[PDB]
Structure formats: C-alpha cells, structure tokens
Amino acid sequence: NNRYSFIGGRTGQWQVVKIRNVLGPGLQLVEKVNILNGSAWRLQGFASNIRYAIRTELEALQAVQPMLNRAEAILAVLIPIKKSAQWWEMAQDERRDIFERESHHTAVGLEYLPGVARRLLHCRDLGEEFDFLTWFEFAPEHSSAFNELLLRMRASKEWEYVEREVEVWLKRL
Amino acid sequence: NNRYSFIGGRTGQWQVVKIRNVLGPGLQLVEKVNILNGSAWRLQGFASNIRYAIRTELEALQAVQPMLNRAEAILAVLIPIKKSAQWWEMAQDERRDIFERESHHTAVGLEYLPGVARRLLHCRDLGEEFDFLTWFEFAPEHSSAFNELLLRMRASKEWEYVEREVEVWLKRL
Numbered sequence: 001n002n003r004y005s006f007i008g009g010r011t012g013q014w015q016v017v018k019i020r021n022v023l024g025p026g027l028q029l030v031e032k033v034n035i036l037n038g039s040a041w042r043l044q045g046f047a048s049n050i051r052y053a054i055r056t057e058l059e060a061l062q063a064v065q066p067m068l069n070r071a072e073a074i075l076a077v078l079i080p081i082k083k084s085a086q087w088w089e090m091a092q093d094e095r096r097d098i099f100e101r102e103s104h105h106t107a108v109g110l111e112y113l114p115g116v117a118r119r120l121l122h123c124r125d126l127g128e129e130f131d132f133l134t135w136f137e138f139a140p141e142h143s144s145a146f147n148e149l150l151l152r153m154r155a156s157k158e159w160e161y162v163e164r165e166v167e168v169w170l171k172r173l
Numbered sequence: 174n175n176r177y178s179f180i181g182g183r184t185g186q187w188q189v190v191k192i193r194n195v196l197g198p199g200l201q202l203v204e205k206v207n208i209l210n211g212s213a214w215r216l217q218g219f220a221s222n223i224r225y226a227i228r229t230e231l232e233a234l235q236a237v238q239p240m241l242n243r244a245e246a247i248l249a250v251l252i253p254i255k256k257s258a259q260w261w262e263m264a265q266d267e268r269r270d271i272f273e274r275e276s277h278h279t280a281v282g283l284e285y286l287p288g289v290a291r292r293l294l295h296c297r298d299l300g301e302e303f304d305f306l307t308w309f310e311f312a313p314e315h316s317s318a319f320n321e322l323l324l325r326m327r328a329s330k331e332w333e334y335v336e337r338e339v340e341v342w343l344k345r346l
C-alpha cells in the first residue's frame with residue numbers, strides 16, 4: 001500500500017523533539033507522531049512515480065542514497081510543504097527548469113548523501129492542506145549538515161513558490 | 174473537488190452503447206454510467222497537474238481545445254488505461270521521450286480538435302486497478318475521426334506499454 005498517515009498525538013514510534021513553524025500556519029506541538037501505512041492532527045500522502053528526475057540523476061541517486069531504517073538513523077524530520085497556485089499552473093518544462101536548472105535541487109541534495117535518507121510523499125491530489133510530506137532520517141552527526149541543507153534550499157528559486165512549510169523534528173523510540 | 178467516480182449500473186446520465194474489452198480483463202456490460210464528483214463496477218480518479226506537456230504545447234492546446242458539455246457533444250467514450258510496471262520505473266526524460274518525441278501524443282491528438290473534447294483523470298496513486306480514466310466527448314459527425322485516432326494511438330510506441338484498456342461508449346441522456 002502506497003498511502004501513509006502521520007498522526008500527531010500521544011502515541012507512536014517517534015518522539016517529537018520540536019516543531020518549527022517556518023512559513024504559514026503551523027502544526028500544534030504534540031508528544032509523538034504515529035506513522036501508519038494506510039491526537040491533534042493527521043497528515044497523509046502517497047508514494048508515487050518520478051516527476052522530474054532524469055535517468056542520469058536517478059543513477060547518481062541510486063549509487064549513494066541510503067535505505068530507510070538504518071540502525072544509526074535515530075533522528076528524523078517530517079517537513080510538510082505547500083507550493084503556490086502559480087507553481088502548479090506552470091507547464092512541465094517550466095517546472096523542471098526551476099527545480100533543477102535554476103535551483104539544482106538534486107545536485108544540492110546529493111551533497112548530503114549518504115548521511116541523509118529520504119522519502120517523498122504526494123498529497124495535493126488528495127485534497128490535503130499541504131502538497132507534499134517530505135521525510136528525512138539520519139544519525140545525529142548529520143544534524144548540522146541537514147540544517148545547512150534546509151537553509152540552502154530555502155535560498156533557491158524553487159522556494160519562491162513555497163507558501164507553507166513546517167518542520168517536525170523527531171527521535172526514534 | 175478533484176475526484177470523480179464512474180458507476181456502471183442501472184442509473185446515470187449516460188446510456189451505454191457498447192463496451193469493447195480491448196486488452197486485458199474487461200468491464201461488465203451495464204445499462205448506464207453514473208458520474209459523480211466526489212451497480213456492477215465503480216471507477217474513480219482525480220484531476221491533476223500537467224506531467225508532460227511543455228508550455229508551447231499547452232499554448233497550442235489552449236488555442237483550440239473545446240469546453241466540456243457542448244450541446245452537440247451527445248456521444249462520449251470512457252477509456253480506462255493501465256500502463257506496465259516497466260513504464261512506471263522509467264525516469265521522467267525517458268517517459269517524455271516516448272510520449273511525445275517518439276509517439277507524438279499531443280501533436281496527433283491536436284489533429285482531432287476542436288471536434289473532440291477530453292478530460293484526463295489519474296488513479297494509479299489511489300491503488301485502483303487502472304492507472305488513468307480518459308474521457309472524450311463529441312458530436313456524431315466526429316465519431317469516424319475519433320475511431321481513426323484510437324487506431325493511430327494504439328500503433329504508437331507509447332501503447333507498447335499499455336497493459337489493460339477498455340472502451341465504454343456512451344450516449345448522453
């Protein structure tokens with residue numbers, strides 16, 4: 001099943017370390033997040049096909065990207081993202097050009113592998129209040145680098161179209 | 174709301190003229206189709222963002238494509254489609270190259286506008302048994318042209334990856 005739910009509340013596999021309400025309405029602070037394949041809030045999204053990456057990029061990613069659930073990867077960050085109406089109205093070439101040619105999303109992110117594992121979920125098509133649920137996990141040694149990655153991405157042209165962003169920092173129980 | 178359901182059964186706005194089980198398991202013949210925004214079978218899908226078309230192609234489409242619900246558009250065809258796992262594993266560049274560079278999907282389709290109106294719905298990501306629900310509607314004077322179009326698309330490289338396909342031909346009640 002390709003659907004995942006993230007329930008903020010009193011139970012779950014992850015302890016909430018902090019929530020940073022970066023842009024737009026935040027998410028209520030809670031004790032834990034419960035993740036279900038299939039309390040104060042619920043987010044959901046689905047795993048899907050590639051929308052932007054080209055073969056040579058997938059090959060580079062596959063050579064270095066780590067798996068989820070490494071024993072060492074006791075920290076995670078859930079980052080729900082919404083992009084603007086102007087973004088979604090653009091054509092596929094226009095969006096690819098912003099994503100990679102101008103913002104270097106994949107090339108920059110590759111600089112943080114193999115430290116950081118990731119998962120991308122989609123939810124605009126479900127009618128959710130965010131467009132994406134992005135998930136990252138890593139060992140503590142990579143926290144500083146991950147915080148640097150976030151600031152680099154927020155400086156990019158792609159991020160001019162981000163209208164809501166929340167960081168939910170987690171620790172594996 | 175971006176979700177649509179198509180219910181084959183005894184009630185609805187469309188009379189079934191015929192069902193052609195083109196490839197793979199078919200759909201049960203029924204009297205009518207009921208279309209709901211939000212019986213023998215139910216199909217559902219969502220309207221989404223552009224995945225392939227580039228800006229100059231959207232411009233060409235917007236110059237000529239007709240609205241849905243024209244008074245004369247008394248015939249329709251609902252065409253559920255499933256593509257193979259090999260298709261979905263390909264990268265975005267590989268899929269785009271097959272879709273347009275090799276198959277000329279948009280260029281060929283444009284030859285049948287403005288006679289044929291259309292809607293594309295996506296449903297792989299809902300876990301449905303098809304990947305897309307395609308909808309076409311037109312006046313009887315365009316039926317022969319539409320049949321030509323179907324034969325051209327089934328001859329294309331893109332259609333080498335189609336693994337299930339059904340035509341539900343409909344008449345507006």
Ligand code: HEM
Binds near residue numbers: 061132265
């Ligand atoms: C850690 C290294 C990262 C790598 C290697 C990376 C890689 C990628 C790739 C290859 C895609 C495109 C997938 C596709 O073609 O469908 C993507 C999409 C996306 N990533 Fe990243 N990413 C990283 C970090 C981040 C971070 C830290 C964020 C959030 C702050 C983020 C947010 C997203 C979003 C929102 C999308 C969807 C873009 C859209 O479809 O418009 N990524 N990522």
Ligand code: HEM
Binds near residue numbers: 252278279291293307
């Ligand atoms: C009538 C003229 C037609 C035109 C102008 C046309 C145009 C298009 C366009 C521009 C797209 C890409 C949308 C995007 O970028 O997301 C598309 C997708 C699609 N069309 Fe057509 N189309 C036509 C006829 C047909 C026919 C007759 C069929 C079915 C037999 C069909 C099946 C599909 C499918 C399955 C997709 C999704 C492709 C994918 O995402 O892999 N189209 N069409």
